[PDB]
Ligand binder design. Structure first.
Ligand SMILES: OC[C@H]1O[C@H](O[C@H]2[C@H](O)[C@@H](O)[C@@H](O[C@H]3[C@H](O)[C@@H](O)[C@H](O)O[C@@H]3CO)O[C@@H]2CO)[C@H](O)[C@@H](O)[C@@H]1O
Ligand SMILES: [Ca+2]
Ligand code: NA
Length: 763
């Protein structure tokens, strides 16, 4: 909750080590050629460093042998030691594994006889064997897949033009119904599989083909650096999010087809990224420099008590709530983090980063990292959690001698406006407190939550409620992520409308409303992968090590909630057509007219946005109605009185859904209206290229609807599958179908009617 500046023996010692031994060299770890291989280790605390060579990454493998051990020597600049140990092995050392045996004091007993010896993999490992205990010497060119030389970054012109899909690699394709091959389900190489369909029946698209259709700009991948919590030699049914770092610069083994050979995971990890780039998707990497799984790490075994934040009592500061904190303010951890980021960008073609507990990382380091990545390309995205997971004890100043500031929401002003911050303001505003699955926000009917949404609409960059972003560029707009409950699960829990993962019409209405808010709000639009298909975790509010089949994306939901997918798909189009919504800066802040005060307690939020981009819509009107009844909303902005509706309770997109004359709109219960000026709609010529299918549910005898009709919307020639309504009482059964239950989208709207008759459920 709090951070404390406390200077002590540990911090002063570490600061002295930086002053004398800070090494800006580029070459720590292994420098490989066919002719020789050089090893470098930074450890001013050591009295000796020994290199151990092996044939295999573990002793259980066929051919496993200790080759030899060698003595590293102190590296001398003049006649002076720079803190670096080095040796050069002459010959071909490709595909050998190694550890270091480091004999070392701690930071507060340098030059003393109080040493211990630790065996460790390289701090600067670029490859490891199974479970990351032994590093591997590799020619990185050999790990490049076919086409890798032609693979470019996929970068957004502006971060605020993004639509982010937060995905776990196992979740993506562990489901058998994903249509991914037995070999590749839950693995890096699932992303390379094109033409995948539900149950491989060839009717409706899944996985990579689904993402192309959905139109997400960005996939954010949950930890795919090497973590501790999956035994890579164990069973395929294991699951962890992987916020348990062991090797920061090595891919996770369990997502590969072979973790024993250290080259395989690298190649396959690159194939995943290439595949996403080929589909025109940007790749954002979840990174966790804020803590390591344990202090029995390569860092601590190489330079004890340097790389972690130390309290005066000798205890490790526990700001992460996982046991330790990485000391970003230290010269050589700062350098490690920035070099690591550059490595993932250059070597793996990563396009941006999501920083776990960014509130533990110091502002100066984050700003230097932003600067470093700008040298590559400023379009490289950065965002993080502007909070910590416990009390943080740090030195007063950084290694540069500037005051320490944590990169929290409170210090947004001190942070680059292109290091964005998760907006828990709009998160809690939309669906209720993330700390309480049963708590209600705006979509469930909270009037007091309205202000959270209203401040969220301008990315908490206009006025101050809870926290203030510098600009929309500094704000991630979201209602749910991997943490806590899924949107749909919180809707279900807070209302009691149904069981977890069961379709309910009112629940789905609330889900559509949340969609409307996210994509008519400024900042970087962000969803949990499958939010658009009503993803459930069966009520699990912390699924980090829960069952694999619980966590996995249920691909059947692309059919069961096809209409909801279609709604998101359409809302995404609206945001990307109307420039004020994807603004990086504050230039549109004074162009909003809210009908009520932003801080108002209300069932209906409405606002207009004046645009200034030629060839776009001139003005947009947006209305959220969380009431259980229809509401007539009259805009305070009466400058436009001819409107074209482009999203309602039924559908969203770029096509006209009907017109409104005047300043008053009828908004159905628990739904949104998005309208644009008539003149602008005509002149801009913005229109949908997507086909539509309308699904009706009719009592055959009378012709009355048993349930509201729904709208599917997708690319022309792409496959769709409709189903009978899941919510219709069990005393009705489908007697016949009119139209094509399944087929392909056309330019013309197609209709399917499920005709119902009287039924009594049997034994
Ligand atoms: O044994 C290791 C620790 O395991 C447990 O911590 C879990 C969390 O319960 C889990 O929610 C997840 O937290 C991370 C969160 O999902 C992510 O968004 C954020 O950026 O970082 C969080 C970690 O700081 O993962 C951790 C670690 O696996 C347990 O609660 C903890 O006490 C144990 O030390
Ligand atoms: Ca691992
Ligand atoms: Na598999």
């Amino acid at each position: 909750s709090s951070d404390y500046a406390r200077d002590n023996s540990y911090t002063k010692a570490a600061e002295d080590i930086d002053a004398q031994y800070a090494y800006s060299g580029n070459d720590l770890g292994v420098t490989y050629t066919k002719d020789a291989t050089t090893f470098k280790v930074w450890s001013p605390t050591a009295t000796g460093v020994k290199l151990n060579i092996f044939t295999k990454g573990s002793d259980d493998e066929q051919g496993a042998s200790k080759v030899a051990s060698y003595t590293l020597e102190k590296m001398l600049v003049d006649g002076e030691w720079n803190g670096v140990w080095t040796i050069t092995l002459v010959g071909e050392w490709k595909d050998y594994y190694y550890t270091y045996s480091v004999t070392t004091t701690d930071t507060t007993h340098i030059g003393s006889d109080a040493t211990k010896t630790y065996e460790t993999q390289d701090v600067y490992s670029t490859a490891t064997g199974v479970n990351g205990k032994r590093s591997m010497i590799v020619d990185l060119d050999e790990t490049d897949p076919e086409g890798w030389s032609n693979d470019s970054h996929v970068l957004l012109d502006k971060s605020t033009k993004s639509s982010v899909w937060e995905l776990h690699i196992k979740d993506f394709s562990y489901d058998k119904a994903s249509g991914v091959s037995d070999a590749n389900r839950g693995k890096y190489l699932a992303f390379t599989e094109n033409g995948t369909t539900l149950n491989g029946e060839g009717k409706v698209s899944t996985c990579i083909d689904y993402l192309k259709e959905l139109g997400v700009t960005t996939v954010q991948l949950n930890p795919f650096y090497d973590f501790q919590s999956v035994n890579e030699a164990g069973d395929d049914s294991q699951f962890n999010w992987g916020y348990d770092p062991v090797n920061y610069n090595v891919p996770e083994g369990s997502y590969s087809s072979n973790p024993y050979d250290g080259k395989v995971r690298i190649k396959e990890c690159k194939e995943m990224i290439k595949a996403l780039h080929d589909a025109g998707i940007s790749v954002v990497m979840d990174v966790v420099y804020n803590h390591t799984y344990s202090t029995d790490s390569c860092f601590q075994y190489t330079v004890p008590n340097y790389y972690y934040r130390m309290k005066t009592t000798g205890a490790f500061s526990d700001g992460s709530g996982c046991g330790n904190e990485g000391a970003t303010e230290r010269a050589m951890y700062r350098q490690y983090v920035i070099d690591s980021l550059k490595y993932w960008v250059n070597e793996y073609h990563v396009d941006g980063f999501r920083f776990a507990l960014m509130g533990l990382m110091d502002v100066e380091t984050m700003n230097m990292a932003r600067e470093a990545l700008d040298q590559i390309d400023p379009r490289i995205t950065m965002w993080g959690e502007g909070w910590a997971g416990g009390d943080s004890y740090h030195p007063t100043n950084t290694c540069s001698g500037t005051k320490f500031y944590p990169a929290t929401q409170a210090n947004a002003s001190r942070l680059s406006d292109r290091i964005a911050i998760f907006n828990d303001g709009i998160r809690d505003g939309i669906k209720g407190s993330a700390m309480d699955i049963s708590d209600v926000g705006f979509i469930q009917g909270s009037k007091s939550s309205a202000k959270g949404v209203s401040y969220g609409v301008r990315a908490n960059s206009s006025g101050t409620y809870k926290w203030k972003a510098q600009a929309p560029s500094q704000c991630v707009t979201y209602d749910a992520c991997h943490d806590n409950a899924t949107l749909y699960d919180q809707i279900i829990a807070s209302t009691g409308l149904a069981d977890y993962g069961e379709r309910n019409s009112e629940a789905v209405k609330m889900n559509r409303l949340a969609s409307a808010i996210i994509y008519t709000s400024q900042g970087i639009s962000f969803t949990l992968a499958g939010e658009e298909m009503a993803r459930s975790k069966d009520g699990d509010t912390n699924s980090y090590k829960s069952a694999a089949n619980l966590n996995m994306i249920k691909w059947q939901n692309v059919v069961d909630y096809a209409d909801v997918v279609s709604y998101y798909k359409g809302m995404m189009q609206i945001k990307s057509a109307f420039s004020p919504l994807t603004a990086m800066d504050n230039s549109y802040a004074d162009k909003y007219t809210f009908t009520k005060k932003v801080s108002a307690s209300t069932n209906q939020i409405s606002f207009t946005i004046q645009n200034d981009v030629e060839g776009e819509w001139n003005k947009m009107a947006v209305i959220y109605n969380n009431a259980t009844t229809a509401a007539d909303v009259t805009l305070s902005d009466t400058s436009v009185t001819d409107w074209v509706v482009i999203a309602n309770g039924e559908t969203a997109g770029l096509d006209s859904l009907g017109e409104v004359t005047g300043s008053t709109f009828t908004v159905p219960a628990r739904s949104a209206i998005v309208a644009v000026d008539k003149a602008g709609y005509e002149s801009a010529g913005i229109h949908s290229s997507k086909g539509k299918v309308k699904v009706n549910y009719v009592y055959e005898a009378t012709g009355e609807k048993l349930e509201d009709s729904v709208i599917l919307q997708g690319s022309v020639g792409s496959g769709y599958v409709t189903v009978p309504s899941a919510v219709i009482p069990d005393t009705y059964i489908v007697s016949r179908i009119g139209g094509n239950a399944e087929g392909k989208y056309t330019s013309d709207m197609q209709e399917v009617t499920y005709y119902y008759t009287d039924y009594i459920p049997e034994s």
